[PDB]
Write a protein that binds this DNA or RNA. Structure first.
Ligand SMILES: [Mg+2]
Ligand SMILES: [Mg+2]
Ligand SMILES: [Mg+2]
Ligand SMILES: [Mg+2]
Ligand SMILES: [Mg+2]
Ligand SMILES: [Mg+2]
Ligand SMILES: [Mg+2]
Length: 70
RNA sequence: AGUCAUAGGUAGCAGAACGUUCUGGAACAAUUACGCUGAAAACAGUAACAGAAUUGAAGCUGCUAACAUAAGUAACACUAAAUGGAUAACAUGGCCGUAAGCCCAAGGUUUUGCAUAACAAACAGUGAAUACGGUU
């Protein structure tokens, strides 16, 4: 609590002290899943969208950990 | 934008809104979204204005589907009996023997034969010639 409010720790810029993003929330995961199902249905497996989405899925991602319940 | 007044509720009555699908206003997601939070709630984060509704579900011993629990529990006790490193051909022992043997009928309709795994059902098999049963 003192680290949050009393000592001066969050006083630098944004480019310093920035964090990796939190992982995508479940609504956005469901939206992306629906988009991928749409793409594989009406555009095909061998499309640029499907292959690019798979290629972006295979690469690792730098994330944080959720601390709260939301 | 400063003072006051009111705000427990079942049945019931009244008012304001959220969300789902579709349509009109030319087209509001081709190449996605993803700072993770905001809001009093229903919720929001891919328009808005109107309209048409098979428009909102823990709650009907409701229906359908999937998955648990009981639980690796109960069961695998009607019988003759098995043994040799094999559901053995060989050897030993046992059981039925008015049957648990043999020949047919009704019914079934290929359930019938072949490979020391295998690639095998995709392959075979039912012969009227004794005055056999039927058909008359
Ligand atoms: Mg009241
Ligand atoms: Mg009161
Ligand atoms: Mg339109
Ligand atoms: Mg209805
Ligand atoms: Mg056992
Ligand atoms: Mg034996
Ligand atoms: Mg017969």
């Amino acid at each position: 609590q003192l680290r949050e409010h009393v000592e001066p720790v969050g006083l630098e810029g944004y480019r310093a002290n920035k964090q990796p993003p939190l992982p995508p929330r479940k609504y956005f995961q469901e939206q992306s899943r629906r988009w991928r199902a749409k793409v594989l249905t009406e555009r095909g497996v061998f499309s640029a969208d499907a292959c690019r989405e798979h290629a972006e899925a295979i690469r690792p991602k730098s994330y944080r950990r959720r601390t709260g319940i939301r």
